[PDB]
Amino acid sequence: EFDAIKIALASPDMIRSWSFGEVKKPETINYRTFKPERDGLFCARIFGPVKDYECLCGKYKRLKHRGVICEKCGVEVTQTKVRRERMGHIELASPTAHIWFLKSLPSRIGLLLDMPLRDIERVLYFESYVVIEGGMTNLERQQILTEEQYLDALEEFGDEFDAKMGAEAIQALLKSMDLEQECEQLREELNETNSETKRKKLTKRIKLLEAFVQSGNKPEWMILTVLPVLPPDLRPLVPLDGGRFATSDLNDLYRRVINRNNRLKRLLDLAAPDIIVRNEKRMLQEAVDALLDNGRRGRAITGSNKRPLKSLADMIKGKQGRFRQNLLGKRVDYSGRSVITVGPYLRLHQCGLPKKMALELFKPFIYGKLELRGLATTIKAAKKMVEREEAVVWDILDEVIREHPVLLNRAPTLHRLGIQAFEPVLIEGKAIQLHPLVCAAYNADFDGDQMAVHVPLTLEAQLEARALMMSTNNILSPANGEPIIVPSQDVVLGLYYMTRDCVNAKGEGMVLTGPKEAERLYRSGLASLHARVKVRITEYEKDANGELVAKTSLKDTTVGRAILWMIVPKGLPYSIVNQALGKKAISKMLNTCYRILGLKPTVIFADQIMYTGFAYAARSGASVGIDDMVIPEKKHEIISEAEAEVAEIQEQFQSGLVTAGERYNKVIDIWAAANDRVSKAMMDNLQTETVINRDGQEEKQVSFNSIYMMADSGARGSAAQIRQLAGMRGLMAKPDGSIIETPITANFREGLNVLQYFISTHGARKGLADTALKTANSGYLTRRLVDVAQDLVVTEDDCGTHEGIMMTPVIEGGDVKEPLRDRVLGRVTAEDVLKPGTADILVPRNTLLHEQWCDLLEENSVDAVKVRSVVSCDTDFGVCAHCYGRDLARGHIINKGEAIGVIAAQSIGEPGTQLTSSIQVKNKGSIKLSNVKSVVNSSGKLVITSRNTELKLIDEFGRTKESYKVPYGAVLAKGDGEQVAGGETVANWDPHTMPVITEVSGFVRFTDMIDGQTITRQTDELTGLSSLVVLDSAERTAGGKDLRPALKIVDAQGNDVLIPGTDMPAQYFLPGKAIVQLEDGVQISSGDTLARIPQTGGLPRVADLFEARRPKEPAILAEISGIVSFGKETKGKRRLVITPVDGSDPYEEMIPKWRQLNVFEGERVERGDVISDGPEAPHDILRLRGVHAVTRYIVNEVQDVYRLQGVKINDKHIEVIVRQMLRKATIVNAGSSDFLEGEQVEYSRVKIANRELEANGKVGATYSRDLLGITKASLATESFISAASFQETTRVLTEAAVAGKRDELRGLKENVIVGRLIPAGTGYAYHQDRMRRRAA
Amino acid sequence: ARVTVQDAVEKIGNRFDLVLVAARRARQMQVGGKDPLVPEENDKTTVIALREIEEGLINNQILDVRERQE
Amino acid sequence: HARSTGSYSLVTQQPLGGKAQFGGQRFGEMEVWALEAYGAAYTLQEMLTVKSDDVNGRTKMYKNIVDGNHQMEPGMPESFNVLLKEIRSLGINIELED
DNA sequence: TTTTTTTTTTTTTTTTTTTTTTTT
DNA sequence: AAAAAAAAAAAAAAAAAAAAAAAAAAA
Ligand SMILES: [Zn+2]
Ligand SMILES: [Zn+2]
């Protein structure tokens, strides 16, 4: 088969080659005999016959006349399907411009001639003339002229002057260019020019011209001369039942075009006046514009139905276009759908299948088996027998169904666990019975949510659905290493009720001879389900070298746990089933079984757990009545206290003691406190209230009140969803998001009056609307993410590299949010981890860190691990397997072939439907400081003179547990290495004020300070001290504006005090609005304060992060290390110049004046230091801080957003999306290579080019990495078909055509469209073979 | 009757050579040229091939060896 | 409702609308990622090659299944040819170089 | 008085899955 | 009786990307 797809412009000769006959008339079919109208969009001698092996004239109507052409009518006697391929060609009487190559915003013709698009559209409208090589006499080549100017020029010159208008003039301009000479001249201009905007324009036009020259295209081909016509079948004219014809809009546009062309040719023949022929030419231009791409130039022309008709463009692009409706996914045979039910008797790997639907699906299989068995003489007899539904067909169907998996698939398949293959089990009825547990994976609830079943047909597909997609194989999610078979909401309640203890139940305290005796006692009713007893249990352990050893002991348990123990497999220990067994305990029991035994034991264990949980929940009869919501006895007392408090606060407001805001805050505070008290009283009276006796007075126990059982167990409940039943339901928010002063003090057990219920509808409608729009935004985000990752396929075993990120546990500022184990588990390291006792290493360089290695690390208490990350993988066209790590739903290293890009995209996108002072030390440890500059203050304490100081709590074990960021100028109560106790405020600072603390001591002298010009006169009347306030630039006189107020500290002798350590005198050039309090001749110490200068969403934030959109406040960083200074200020901005001590000085930056600064004109700041302050732009982080910095920032941000809502996403996926995000690079130096100076080239191409150049003696080029948003990181792709599906299609296809690009069908998308095998899954090897046979 | 393929992936690595090898073996068994090795017990060619792979009497190497013998 | 050999469309050879028209289900853009995430290639290949689109392949597998042979002859989707023709209707020339 | 940068303004894309009196 | 295209339509948010026009700010 073919290997690559080429796309390029169409020359008129090529269009002639495609076609098979010109169309000369608008007719379609005769109304009396609906047969092709000659020379009409439906012909017979041009676009093939209408009937198989039959001519239109009917002279030859036999197969034996194959290939002949009937003399009467000239029809080639062939198949009718040839009508699907033959094309025509319409010869325009005038050239017509192609709208795609005219009105695409980077208009190809617009910048080809360097002519403004307005002046081109004016020409196409016959509104003005244009010189066409008129000679260097009086007018220029590209000069435009109006009617009067053209007439004056014609009077001036009759000859040696050529001017025209319209498509003819544009085509002449295109034909008259010299691409090579123009390219050389423009390259010279680019070399000489310096203007950056002019530079970019010249490089863009150079790139266009060079692309044209390299490709076989010619500029004149842009202008349309010969118009191809789609084959008739693709625009059908079928007669609807009853003599009515259904036709597409391509026909209307083509008819319009042919009619206009006929009128134009007739007018030219008749020699009509200039105005009429010009009008007809313009109208033909508009008609062809509508046919090519309707609704772009002018307003879309409608039909008789008053709607914008669909043209070829609308058929290509759009969600209804061929790409996204008939290529990337199509309706599928051997398929069906229905509603679902529970069907708990099923095993984990078989779903029900209605008899009727199953019969319809597997019909060809039934026919094959029947004609094999001989019961059907012919296929028609078999069809009739199946249709009548004979009794023999059922045995055949049950024979076929035996081993033939069917793929169940829900409608929103967000992630790969939304298509799973079960083994059908025939069921009477019309419901697709589905195993209950898998609902958790599907998020399928039996409220009428429908499901589709597909049937794998081929042998390979059957084995695929048997070995990859089976439900029993997906016992572990792709996003995180936790199971996805957690017993969900009813099985869990059954186990919880069945694994419990009652202080005194029937038959408590006897001794049993094992689980069998316990079950036997329970069934007869002699001993209650849960009564404390002693049982002899044998538990097995595999501590030996794969050999199980048993140990028998007389454990103390309940009869319920004794019954449960018969289901747990051999290996697990008894202590797992010796507790309350809620939802976390049971899920962790499943996880322990999976990790200790394997897969099959855990599958059978899950099935048994489900069966027994259902059975014993049934035996419980766990109900819920109106006596199971015990409203607290002290609720009314709390509400009375709250009302008294709010009344007192209102009275205080009447006295004016409290302002409106303060009283509002106090009232909300008291209401929150009262609500919390009520909830606590509720829980105390609900969870422990049950009291019984056992040979004594009384004793308390965990209560069996049904709602407490359904809340504590985690089975469809929570402490939050309760307290709206018994205790008051708190406060409700208004549409603005505010919190209403008066909460609603009635729960659901007591009913809500009119106003309180009406208040409690803002929340409900806000939630419903948020969900309704969140599903849409999440779908869009998932599509973009998976179309940015739709190339990542693991093709290598190891890239052989050392680079990697440094993974460390994350600390928000307080306690650790996530330890090192969760983030590091199942990844390949980058260097030999070594214990704090660095005399020996800890782990090898390239060992997959499984559980044992992580536990060893925890024992040795390591802080950071240099781990290889996908962002750093050195492979091209993929990533090394060792770079990715553990497979996440396989317990081993990733498998060479898994399409990590798609699974990572789906993992990130699925949760989208689940989204929208001082310091206090907690633990006892030693203070540590990182990147800190500090000096002793006037009072003997320590003051930080650095910006990026980080405090850490190094416990006695040497591991950080707490981290803090300190602003500039903070007083430390203690010092580094000083052990401190919990609750100690080691440091404190003022949230307001910006200090200018100094570094020297001595008398204060008024240096470069002038009243009025630099400062004003003001006195703090509160204390009577005169303060020296610096005026702003917009107020101070220009005379003193050049002068910056400063404070040079000197001694009593007049000598200038020099900065400690350094030699420069200490001068602090104060900025505007600085309030110096201390006056002249005032002695000050080091660090004395001179001026106390005064001062998102869940899903949208993730969308912005992956789009890499510059935030509202683009906090600018230190572009280069060096001392700061101010240059020539301008009106709108300040000139900040950063000059290194020994580097290049000239760089400067314009900063808006209103922006707040953080450098006092003398702080030497290294590269990357935040100059402004605010949210960072990821592009800045990538450009300055490197590659690891931006990936770290993105990972941290997205993980914060996700963990905020309690969703886990292993960081590999975000890293993969990041690797795809920053994949392009812009050349800085061309070097010995052959790359343009500023051209933006894919990273892999430049990388391999540089590597293979360095293999030679030539010097490689320098590249600056670039970061592009997901949408733009997708639209700029090597292949054009892959980028032609998910985005603007007109732009992509136009760019591909003009560039003459060439796609090679290498990704996960182009192969999908073309129908060939996939280079990711089972087809991987095949593709490799296809590569190996080639070039061999 | 079969449930899982864990032993199969343990025998043949990559869980993708498994699918292809089982597919080819089942294809030989299905078209009426060849005969099975493991005693058929009412299963289908796919599950029989997976039984052969799991028990360890066939893999890509053995399959190619039996092919080149013929 | 389920379909196995219902009548196909005319413009792009594919199954028809659901239920009353006897059509299949939509293996949509979101249901092809669900397979690519797996190691599923052959199943996807058939799901968008011979189950819906390729004009002769579905008939060939029909006869094979009736003949007891489980295989395919994938060919190329007819909708891809439709897209090629529709792109060629514009002024852009597209072909399949080998 | 010309030229480059930066800013503004207009325009172009995207926005979930399935189920009728009048000329030839 | 077979065919056939004008209109005066007018209308939407929200958000963001990208190209074109306009205004500083010089030397
Ligand atoms: Zn004829
Ligand atoms: Zn690598």
PDB file of C-alpha atoms in Angstrom, chain A residues 2-10 14 18 84-85 87 98 100-101 228 230 234 236 238 254 312 315-316 322-337 357 360-361 363-365 367-368 371 379 409 411 413 416 419 455 457-462 464 468-469 474 783 786 790 899 902-903 906 1297 1302 1308 1312-1315 1317-1318 1321-1323, chain C residues 1-18 22-53 55 58 61-63 65-68 70-72 74-98:
ATOM      1  CA  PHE A   2       0.967   3.666  -0.240  1.00  0.00           C
ATOM      2  CA  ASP A   3       3.345   5.114   2.350  1.00  0.00           C
ATOM      3  CA  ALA A   4       2.877   8.902   2.470  1.00  0.00           C
ATOM      4  CA  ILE A   5       0.388  11.601   1.482  1.00  0.00           C
ATOM      5  CA  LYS A   6       1.462  14.657  -0.523  1.00  0.00           C
ATOM      6  CA  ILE A   7      -0.571  17.868  -0.790  1.00  0.00           C
ATOM      7  CA  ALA A   8       0.126  20.733  -3.195  1.00  0.00           C
ATOM      8  CA  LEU A   9      -1.649  23.332  -5.299  1.00  0.00           C
ATOM      9  CA  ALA A  10      -3.634  22.256  -8.362  1.00  0.00           C
ATOM     10  CA  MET A  14      -3.698  18.671 -13.422  1.00  0.00           C
ATOM     11  CA  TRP A  18      -8.362  14.432 -13.155  1.00  0.00           C
ATOM     12  CA  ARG A  84     -18.293   7.837  -7.457  1.00  0.00           C
ATOM     13  CA  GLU A  85     -14.857   8.657  -8.931  1.00  0.00           C
ATOM     14  CA  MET A  87     -14.866  14.240 -12.137  1.00  0.00           C
ATOM     15  CA  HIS A  98      -9.332  31.324  -4.837  1.00  0.00           C
ATOM     16  CA  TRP A 100      -8.899  30.262   0.609  1.00  0.00           C
ATOM     17  CA  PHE A 101      -5.660  31.691  -0.808  1.00  0.00           C
ATOM     18  CA  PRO A 228     -13.249  20.834 -10.769  1.00  0.00           C
ATOM     19  CA  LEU A 230     -17.374  16.743  -7.368  1.00  0.00           C
ATOM     20  CA  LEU A 234     -21.166  12.620  -3.710  1.00  0.00           C
ATOM     21  CA  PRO A 236     -26.890  12.857  -4.736  1.00  0.00           C
ATOM     22  CA  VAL A 238     -32.213  10.716  -5.155  1.00  0.00           C
ATOM     23  CA  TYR A 254     -22.693  24.634  -9.213  1.00  0.00           C
ATOM     24  CA  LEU A 312     -17.187  22.225   0.192  1.00  0.00           C
ATOM     25  CA  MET A 315     -18.395  19.805   4.394  1.00  0.00           C
ATOM     26  CA  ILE A 316     -14.686  19.618   5.279  1.00  0.00           C
ATOM     27  CA  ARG A 322     -15.921  14.483   7.302  1.00  0.00           C
ATOM     28  CA  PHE A 323     -12.895  14.578   9.607  1.00  0.00           C
ATOM     29  CA  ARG A 324     -14.774  14.515  12.926  1.00  0.00           C
ATOM     30  CA  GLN A 325     -17.981  12.732  11.819  1.00  0.00           C
ATOM     31  CA  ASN A 326     -16.975  10.142   9.194  1.00  0.00           C
ATOM     32  CA  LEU A 327     -13.186   9.664   9.502  1.00  0.00           C
ATOM     33  CA  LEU A 328     -12.114   9.839  13.161  1.00  0.00           C
ATOM     34  CA  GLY A 329     -15.237   7.904  14.174  1.00  0.00           C
ATOM     35  CA  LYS A 330     -18.111   6.339  12.253  1.00  0.00           C
ATOM     36  CA  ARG A 331     -21.288   4.424  12.968  1.00  0.00           C
ATOM     37  CA  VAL A 332     -20.484   0.741  13.347  1.00  0.00           C
ATOM     38  CA  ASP A 333     -22.168  -2.489  12.273  1.00  0.00           C
ATOM     39  CA  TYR A 334     -22.554  -5.494  14.584  1.00  0.00           C
ATOM     40  CA  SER A 335     -23.568  -3.151  17.390  1.00  0.00           C
ATOM     41  CA  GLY A 336     -26.496  -2.306  19.622  1.00  0.00           C
ATOM     42  CA  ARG A 337     -27.581  -0.338  22.665  1.00  0.00           C
ATOM     43  CA  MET A 357     -30.343  -8.288  20.772  1.00  0.00           C
ATOM     44  CA  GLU A 360     -29.499  -9.745  15.954  1.00  0.00           C
ATOM     45  CA  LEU A 361     -25.822  -9.014  16.664  1.00  0.00           C
ATOM     46  CA  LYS A 363     -26.469 -13.190  12.918  1.00  0.00           C
ATOM     47  CA  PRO A 364     -23.650 -13.897  10.401  1.00  0.00           C
ATOM     48  CA  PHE A 365     -22.095 -16.228  12.971  1.00  0.00           C
ATOM     49  CA  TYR A 367     -25.618 -18.369   9.444  1.00  0.00           C
ATOM     50  CA  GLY A 368     -22.060 -19.673   9.243  1.00  0.00           C
ATOM     51  CA  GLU A 371     -24.511 -23.771   6.877  1.00  0.00           C
ATOM     52  CA  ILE A 379     -28.248 -18.636   2.768  1.00  0.00           C
ATOM     53  CA  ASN A 409     -19.226   0.994  26.176  1.00  0.00           C
ATOM     54  CA  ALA A 411     -21.799   7.187  26.208  1.00  0.00           C
ATOM     55  CA  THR A 413     -16.185   7.348  27.683  1.00  0.00           C
ATOM     56  CA  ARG A 416      -9.971   3.979  28.662  1.00  0.00           C
ATOM     57  CA  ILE A 419     -14.819   0.404  27.010  1.00  0.00           C
ATOM     58  CA  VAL A 455     -18.876  -7.276  18.746  1.00  0.00           C
ATOM     59  CA  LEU A 457     -15.285  -9.902  14.566  1.00  0.00           C
ATOM     60  CA  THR A 458     -11.777 -10.953  13.544  1.00  0.00           C
ATOM     61  CA  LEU A 459      -9.662 -13.513  15.370  1.00  0.00           C
ATOM     62  CA  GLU A 460      -7.084 -10.911  16.400  1.00  0.00           C
ATOM     63  CA  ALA A 461      -9.804  -8.623  17.751  1.00  0.00           C
ATOM     64  CA  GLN A 462     -11.311 -11.477  19.764  1.00  0.00           C
ATOM     65  CA  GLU A 464      -7.457  -8.518  21.965  1.00  0.00           C
ATOM     66  CA  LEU A 468      -6.262  -6.565  26.913  1.00  0.00           C
ATOM     67  CA  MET A 469      -9.788  -5.207  27.386  1.00  0.00           C
ATOM     68  CA  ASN A 474      -8.430  -3.894  34.357  1.00  0.00           C
ATOM     69  CA  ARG A 783     -10.165  16.688  23.279  1.00  0.00           C
ATOM     70  CA  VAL A 786      -5.521  14.074  23.780  1.00  0.00           C
ATOM     71  CA  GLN A 790      -1.710  11.991  19.987  1.00  0.00           C
ATOM     72  CA  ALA A 899       0.303   5.074  23.779  1.00  0.00           C
ATOM     73  CA  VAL A 902      -3.539   9.177  25.014  1.00  0.00           C
ATOM     74  CA  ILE A 903      -3.833   7.536  28.435  1.00  0.00           C
ATOM     75  CA  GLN A 906      -7.553  10.876  29.308  1.00  0.00           C
ATOM     76  CA  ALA A1297      -1.063  23.380   0.082  1.00  0.00           C
ATOM     77  CA  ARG A1302       4.242  16.059   2.851  1.00  0.00           C
ATOM     78  CA  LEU A1308      -1.827   7.874  16.021  1.00  0.00           C
ATOM     79  CA  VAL A1312      -6.571   6.172  12.228  1.00  0.00           C
ATOM     80  CA  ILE A1313      -8.068   8.293   9.440  1.00  0.00           C
ATOM     81  CA  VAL A1314      -6.520   6.219   6.637  1.00  0.00           C
ATOM     82  CA  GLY A1315      -7.736   2.986   8.248  1.00  0.00           C
ATOM     83  CA  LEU A1317      -3.075  -0.333  11.579  1.00  0.00           C
ATOM     84  CA  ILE A1318      -2.212   1.737  14.652  1.00  0.00           C
ATOM     85  CA  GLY A1321      -1.162  -1.151  20.090  1.00  0.00           C
ATOM     86  CA  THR A1322      -0.901  -4.635  18.629  1.00  0.00           C
ATOM     87  CA  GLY A1323       0.064  -3.064  15.291  1.00  0.00           C
TER      88      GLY A1323
ATOM     89  CA  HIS C   1     -32.078  -2.216  19.188  1.00  0.00           C
ATOM     90  CA  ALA C   2     -29.152  -3.907  17.448  1.00  0.00           C
ATOM     91  CA  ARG C   3     -27.906  -4.077  13.873  1.00  0.00           C
ATOM     92  CA  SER C   4     -25.703  -6.478  11.930  1.00  0.00           C
ATOM     93  CA  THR C   5     -26.290  -5.962   8.183  1.00  0.00           C
ATOM     94  CA  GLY C   6     -28.642  -3.008   7.888  1.00  0.00           C
ATOM     95  CA  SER C   7     -28.664  -0.846   4.787  1.00  0.00           C
ATOM     96  CA  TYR C   8     -25.817   1.654   4.471  1.00  0.00           C
ATOM     97  CA  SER C   9     -25.706   5.330   3.503  1.00  0.00           C
ATOM     98  CA  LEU C  10     -25.091   6.873   0.059  1.00  0.00           C
ATOM     99  CA  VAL C  11     -22.662   9.795   0.379  1.00  0.00           C
ATOM    100  CA  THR C  12     -20.174   8.075   2.707  1.00  0.00           C
ATOM    101  CA  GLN C  13     -20.788   4.336   2.914  1.00  0.00           C
ATOM    102  CA  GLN C  14     -21.663   3.898   6.593  1.00  0.00           C
ATOM    103  CA  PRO C  15     -24.495   2.623   8.802  1.00  0.00           C
ATOM    104  CA  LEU C  16     -27.628   4.737   9.045  1.00  0.00           C
ATOM    105  CA  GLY C  17     -29.512   6.431  11.872  1.00  0.00           C
ATOM    106  CA  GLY C  18     -30.510   4.535  14.960  1.00  0.00           C
ATOM    107  CA  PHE C  22     -32.014   0.063  11.854  1.00  0.00           C
ATOM    108  CA  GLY C  23     -28.636   1.750  12.329  1.00  0.00           C
ATOM    109  CA  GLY C  24     -25.729   0.805  14.545  1.00  0.00           C
ATOM    110  CA  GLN C  25     -24.079   2.845  17.275  1.00  0.00           C
ATOM    111  CA  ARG C  26     -21.590   5.705  17.090  1.00  0.00           C
ATOM    112  CA  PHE C  27     -17.956   4.687  17.534  1.00  0.00           C
ATOM    113  CA  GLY C  28     -17.225   8.365  17.929  1.00  0.00           C
ATOM    114  CA  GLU C  29     -14.062  10.390  18.334  1.00  0.00           C
ATOM    115  CA  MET C  30     -14.222   9.728  22.085  1.00  0.00           C
ATOM    116  CA  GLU C  31     -14.541   5.947  21.562  1.00  0.00           C
ATOM    117  CA  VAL C  32     -11.381   5.678  19.444  1.00  0.00           C
ATOM    118  CA  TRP C  33      -9.190   7.106  22.205  1.00  0.00           C
ATOM    119  CA  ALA C  34     -10.712   4.504  24.524  1.00  0.00           C
ATOM    120  CA  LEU C  35      -9.108   1.882  22.260  1.00  0.00           C
ATOM    121  CA  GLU C  36      -5.830   3.650  21.468  1.00  0.00           C
ATOM    122  CA  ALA C  37      -5.237   3.875  25.220  1.00  0.00           C
ATOM    123  CA  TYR C  38      -5.240   0.079  25.257  1.00  0.00           C
ATOM    124  CA  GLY C  39      -2.873  -1.878  23.073  1.00  0.00           C
ATOM    125  CA  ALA C  40      -5.883  -2.210  20.779  1.00  0.00           C
ATOM    126  CA  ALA C  41      -5.004  -1.889  17.088  1.00  0.00           C
ATOM    127  CA  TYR C  42      -6.766  -4.685  15.198  1.00  0.00           C
ATOM    128  CA  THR C  43     -10.066  -4.028  16.974  1.00  0.00           C
ATOM    129  CA  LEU C  44      -9.811  -0.324  16.152  1.00  0.00           C
ATOM    130  CA  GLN C  45      -8.658  -1.149  12.623  1.00  0.00           C
ATOM    131  CA  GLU C  46     -11.824  -3.139  11.983  1.00  0.00           C
ATOM    132  CA  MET C  47     -14.053  -0.740  13.923  1.00  0.00           C
ATOM    133  CA  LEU C  48     -13.177   2.051  11.464  1.00  0.00           C
ATOM    134  CA  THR C  49     -12.120  -0.003   8.402  1.00  0.00           C
ATOM    135  CA  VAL C  50     -14.365  -2.990   7.648  1.00  0.00           C
ATOM    136  CA  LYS C  51     -17.300  -2.742  10.068  1.00  0.00           C
ATOM    137  CA  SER C  52     -18.496   0.585   8.655  1.00  0.00           C
ATOM    138  CA  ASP C  53     -16.549   2.025   5.737  1.00  0.00           C
ATOM    139  CA  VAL C  55     -17.101  -1.137   0.609  1.00  0.00           C
ATOM    140  CA  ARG C  58     -17.491  -5.967   4.905  1.00  0.00           C
ATOM    141  CA  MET C  61     -15.744 -10.815   6.004  1.00  0.00           C
ATOM    142  CA  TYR C  62     -19.464 -11.575   5.755  1.00  0.00           C
ATOM    143  CA  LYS C  63     -18.693 -14.483   3.437  1.00  0.00           C
ATOM    144  CA  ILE C  65     -17.722 -15.615   8.768  1.00  0.00           C
ATOM    145  CA  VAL C  66     -20.455 -17.519   6.943  1.00  0.00           C
ATOM    146  CA  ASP C  67     -17.570 -19.684   5.690  1.00  0.00           C
ATOM    147  CA  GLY C  68     -16.289 -20.103   9.258  1.00  0.00           C
ATOM    148  CA  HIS C  70     -12.254 -15.320  11.017  1.00  0.00           C
ATOM    149  CA  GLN C  71     -10.148 -12.772   9.131  1.00  0.00           C
ATOM    150  CA  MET C  72     -10.358  -9.556   7.121  1.00  0.00           C
ATOM    151  CA  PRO C  74      -9.015  -4.178   5.396  1.00  0.00           C
ATOM    152  CA  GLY C  75      -8.443  -2.109   2.283  1.00  0.00           C
ATOM    153  CA  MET C  76      -9.060   1.607   2.758  1.00  0.00           C
ATOM    154  CA  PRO C  77     -12.125   3.382   4.202  1.00  0.00           C
ATOM    155  CA  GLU C  78     -14.473   4.703   1.533  1.00  0.00           C
ATOM    156  CA  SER C  79     -14.894   7.917   3.531  1.00  0.00           C
ATOM    157  CA  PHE C  80     -11.183   8.615   3.063  1.00  0.00           C
ATOM    158  CA  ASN C  81     -11.695   8.462  -0.700  1.00  0.00           C
ATOM    159  CA  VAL C  82     -14.701  10.750  -0.240  1.00  0.00           C
ATOM    160  CA  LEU C  83     -12.501  13.258   1.590  1.00  0.00           C
ATOM    161  CA  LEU C  84      -9.819  12.996  -1.096  1.00  0.00           C
ATOM    162  CA  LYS C  85     -12.381  13.722  -3.812  1.00  0.00           C
ATOM    163  CA  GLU C  86     -13.897  16.629  -1.879  1.00  0.00           C
ATOM    164  CA  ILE C  87     -10.456  18.158  -1.288  1.00  0.00           C
ATOM    165  CA  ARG C  88      -9.670  17.690  -4.986  1.00  0.00           C
ATOM    166  CA  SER C  89     -12.893  19.576  -5.744  1.00  0.00           C
ATOM    167  CA  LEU C  90     -11.158  22.643  -4.308  1.00  0.00           C
ATOM    168  CA  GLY C  91      -8.050  24.088  -5.949  1.00  0.00           C
ATOM    169  CA  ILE C  92      -5.778  21.885  -3.812  1.00  0.00           C
ATOM    170  CA  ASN C  93      -4.251  18.749  -5.344  1.00  0.00           C
ATOM    171  CA  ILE C  94      -3.953  15.773  -2.978  1.00  0.00           C
ATOM    172  CA  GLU C  95      -2.742  12.257  -3.767  1.00  0.00           C
ATOM    173  CA  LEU C  96      -1.212   9.198  -2.098  1.00  0.00           C
ATOM    174  CA  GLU C  97       2.467   8.863  -2.994  1.00  0.00           C
ATOM    175  CA  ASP C  98       3.946   5.392  -2.512  1.00  0.00           C
TER     176      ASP C  98
END
